[PDB]
């Protein structure tokens, strides 16, 4: 995981405290399927910090809803809003590649 | 940038009625600006506010406009004749 | 007989204990019959596991419905997931480029 | 009196215990009458087992309606059952085994 970050405050320079929304599509990164379940951050004081698995995610706020792709090391969510991609990467070199893994893992030399 | 105005009655009593200011979601100094739409009231006639620089909207009443805050202290009369 | 296990996690690596579905068509296997009965799975604390007969299986989450082989040795569920999509049973040995150059990889135990 | 029998599950190997349920036309055996009544079977524990008398018989599971002739000995109830039964739908496990085979062995001297 990478910590994401970002300060959140209203018009009048006081903290706003609303939940941002986290998701993915199904894909399995190192051992681990990583599921659609939309999770719901607080920020705190304002501050809003979540650690996500770094490749694909999906961001929502009230109306809006972005493609990030999140980096290898930790950054500001707005650098990841203002380069959100148009539509989501499709799996099918993954799923071919994974195929392959798991019967190699399935009877190993 | 701070913002500030006295507010009255045509009779110059104070009018604390609540203003209220808003922005589309964007980014200022690192710091992400919400849609929240603030009310303030006037406290003895005078409202006192800091505003991030670029567009926000304002509301009285029936009344609504678009400033556009500069980056030094200012009326907010002379924000709203702008418009 | 066969167990088939994943690691299933959300969007920032925390545990997503959502149910997985299991059935098969009515047919027989190691003498015994297999009815069409939809078998619920959670996993516990991030971790599925689920005993499977071989042969023939259906997976059903959320959305997605994966028609599945159960090998005759213990596996991970998504190599099962990602050979059901990638290789449809009309695939016409296609020979997978000899598996992507096998990704120029092997190592004994 | 012939035992037909079963063992009964679900895709993760444990019991399925959903009722079978056993009937005939009217006919006669040994002189007795035989009726339509349907008899309605538990499996236990996942065994399932039945007294039937011989001849015509029908089993119903399910969806399923089944027609079968009860031998005159102690048979095993899928191997009637299974000329009836659709067989399940081909699917591509054996062709990617086959393609991931061929390899050119690595060996590696460590």
């Known amino acids: ?109 | 940038t701070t913002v500030t105005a006295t507010v009255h009655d045509i009779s110059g009593r104070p009018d604390d009625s609540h203003w209220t200011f808003s922005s589309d979601l964007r980014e200022q100094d690192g710091v992400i600006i919400t849609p929240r739409v603030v009310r303030v009231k006037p406290f003895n006639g005078e409202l006192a506010l800091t505003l991030p620089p670029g567009p926000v909207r304002v509301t009285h009443h029936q009344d609504r406009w678009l400033i556009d805050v500069p980056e030094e202290d200012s009326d907010l009369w002379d924000l709203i004749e702008a418009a």
């Open chain 1, 1 to 109: 995981t990478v910590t994401i970050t970002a300060d959140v405050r209203d018009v009048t320079g006081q903290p706003d405290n609303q939940q941002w929304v986290f998701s993915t599509v199904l894909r399995q990164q190192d051992g681990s399927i990583l599921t659609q379940k939309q999770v719901r951050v607080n920020p705190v004081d304002g501050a809003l910090s979540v650690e996500l698995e770094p490749g694909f995610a999906i961001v929502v706020y009230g109306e809006y809803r972005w493609f990030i792709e999140v980096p290898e090391t930790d950054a500001g969510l707005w650098g990841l809003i203002a380069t959100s991609v148009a539509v989501p990467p499709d799996t099918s070199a993954e799923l071919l590649a994974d195929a392959v893994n798991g019967y190699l893992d399935a009877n190993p030399p």
